[PDB]
Amino acid sequence: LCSLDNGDCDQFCVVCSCARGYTLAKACIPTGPYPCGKQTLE
Amino acid sequence: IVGGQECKDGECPWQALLINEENEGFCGGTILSEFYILTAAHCLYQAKRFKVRVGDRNTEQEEGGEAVHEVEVVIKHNRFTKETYDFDIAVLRLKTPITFRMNVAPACLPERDWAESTLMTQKTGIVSGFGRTHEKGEQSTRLKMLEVPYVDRNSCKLSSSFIITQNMFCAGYDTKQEDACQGDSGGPHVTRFKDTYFVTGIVSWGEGCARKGKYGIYTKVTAFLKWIDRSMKT
Ligand SMILES: O=C(CN1C[C@H](NC(=O)c2ccc(Cl)s2)[C@@H](F)C1)Nc1ccc(-n2ccccc2=O)cc1F
Ligand SMILES: [Ca+2]
Ligand SMILES: [Cl-]
Ligand SMILES: [Cl-]
Ligand code: NA
Ligand code: NA
Numbered sequence: 309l310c311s312l313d314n315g316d317c318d319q320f321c322v323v324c325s326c327a328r329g330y331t332l333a334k335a336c337i338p339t340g341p342y343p344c345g346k347q348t349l350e
Numbered sequence: 351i352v353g354g355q356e357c358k359d360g361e362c363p364w365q366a367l368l369i370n371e372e373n374e375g376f377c378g379g380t381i382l383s384e385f386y387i388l389t390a391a392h393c394l395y396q397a398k399r400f401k402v403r404v405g406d407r408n409t410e411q412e413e414g415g416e417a418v419h420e421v422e423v424v425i426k427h428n429r430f431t432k433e434t435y436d437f438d439i440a441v442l443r444l445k446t447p448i449t450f451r452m453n454v455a456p457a458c459l460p461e462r463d464w465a466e467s468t469l470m471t472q473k474t475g476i477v478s479g480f481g482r483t484h485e486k487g488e489q490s491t492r493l494k495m496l497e498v499p500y501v502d503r504n505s506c507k508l509s510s511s512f513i514i515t516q517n518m519f520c521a522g523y524d525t526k527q528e529d530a531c532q533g534d535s536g537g538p539h540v541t542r543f544k545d546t547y548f549v550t551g552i553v554s555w556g557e558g559c560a561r562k563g564k565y566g567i568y569t570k571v572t573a574f575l576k577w578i579d580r581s582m583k584t
């Protein structure tokens with residue numbers, strides 16, 4: 309159940325999903341320098 | 351934005367600003383992708399023609415990373431009307447793609463069912479924009495952000511002179527003097543879930559700004575995930 313701890317998924321939920329600009333490692337890993345929804349660093 | 355604070359470098363990188371024929375901001379938007387900006391349908395009525403500025407944090411200084419984009423296509427929800435302010439959503443397709451960089455990056459679109467149970471149940475979200483810093487005051491020259499609590503729909507309906515629809519949600523404070531304001535409309539409301547920010551709202555309307563016993567009203571992005579997906583594929 310995603311009912312508890314999101315099924316451990318870092319993002320979408322068992323089966324995990326990630327938003328565009330990420331791949332499923334559970335965790336989600338950026339595929340580029342500016343993945344969605346992350347504050348940018350210099 | 352009334353109250354809140356300034357966005358630092360990289361902190362609100364999904365903010366877009368719609369600029370009118372005077373090169374002045376009049377509404378916000380949310381970067382969704384290289385070619386798409388999310389905004390409020392009601393904003394489309396409020397300029398003769400407009401363009402999109404990304405990467406700006408100070409409208410009085412030209413800073414590294416600012417860029418201007420023209421709009422190729424406007425997709426306005428057919429059901430929007432000023433009679434109700436319901437369906438207050440539009441998507442802009444840009445002529446040229448945005449280059450992501452410091453201060454320019456998309457907000458994530460959540461998946462629907464997951465979003466309702468997981469995002470809409472969080473305590474707070476973040477709203478941002480270049481709007482007025484007081485109800486009767488001037489637009490901010492600096493990009494601001496504000497943490498706003500999700501507000502119970504029933505308390506919100508009780509407080510409101512107008513109908514709150516299923517395509518809206520309420521956020522902000524009963525009496526604390528912090529809220530979005532004129533000029534912030536169309537801009538992002540994002541909710542953080544485990545290190546990632548997802549777009550959950552579009553700044554839509556309010557009875558004044560930061561009024562006692564009134565809240566801010568946002569277009570409920572989860573109500574339109576399919577609509578947004580279809581618009582971005584058109
Ligand atoms: O017209 C105004 C003018 N306001 C807008 C400005 N406030 C804001 O834009 C916001 C405050 C908080 C948020 Cl979120 S957005 C304020 F400075 C003056 N507010 C408003 C009030 C009610 C509605 N409304 C709501 C439902 C049905 C009809 C209708 O007109 C729309 C509106 F735009
Ligand atoms: Ca600037
Ligand atoms: Cl409704
Ligand atoms: Cl008003
Ligand atoms: Na800060
Ligand atoms: Na809640």
Ligand code: NA
Pocket residue numbers: 522523524525526560561562563564565
């Ligand atoms: Na209030």
